[PDB]
Amino acid sequence: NDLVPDQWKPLFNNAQWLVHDIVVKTIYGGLIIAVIAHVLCWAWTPWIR
């Protein structure tokens, strides 16, 4: 677990930290895409009305 910050060493393995980084970046990219999709769908047809 040398790659893990010592704050998260009790929780994250060395390999689990890299997979967690991938998951975090994927969640962030998906969030940006979801925000863009929501803005586009609102400009198209507002659902709240």
Partner 1 sequence: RPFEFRTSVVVSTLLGLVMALLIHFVVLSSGAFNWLRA
Output the CA–CA distances (angstroms, integers) from residue 4 to 22, 24, 39, 40, in the order listed: 14, 15, 37, 39
Judged by CB under 6 A, the residue of 3, 15, 23, 35 near ligand KGD is 23
Q: CA-based angle 29:35:36, to the nearest 5?
A: 90
Residue 29 is which amino acid?
G
* Residue 44 interacting partner from ligand KGD, ligand BCL, partner 1, none (CB closer than 5 to 8 Å by kind): partner 1
Chain residues that interact with a second copy, rule: CB under 8 A: 7-8, 10-11, 14-15, 18-19, 44, 48
Chain residues that interact with ligand KGD, rule: CB under 6 A: 19, 22-23, 26-27, 30
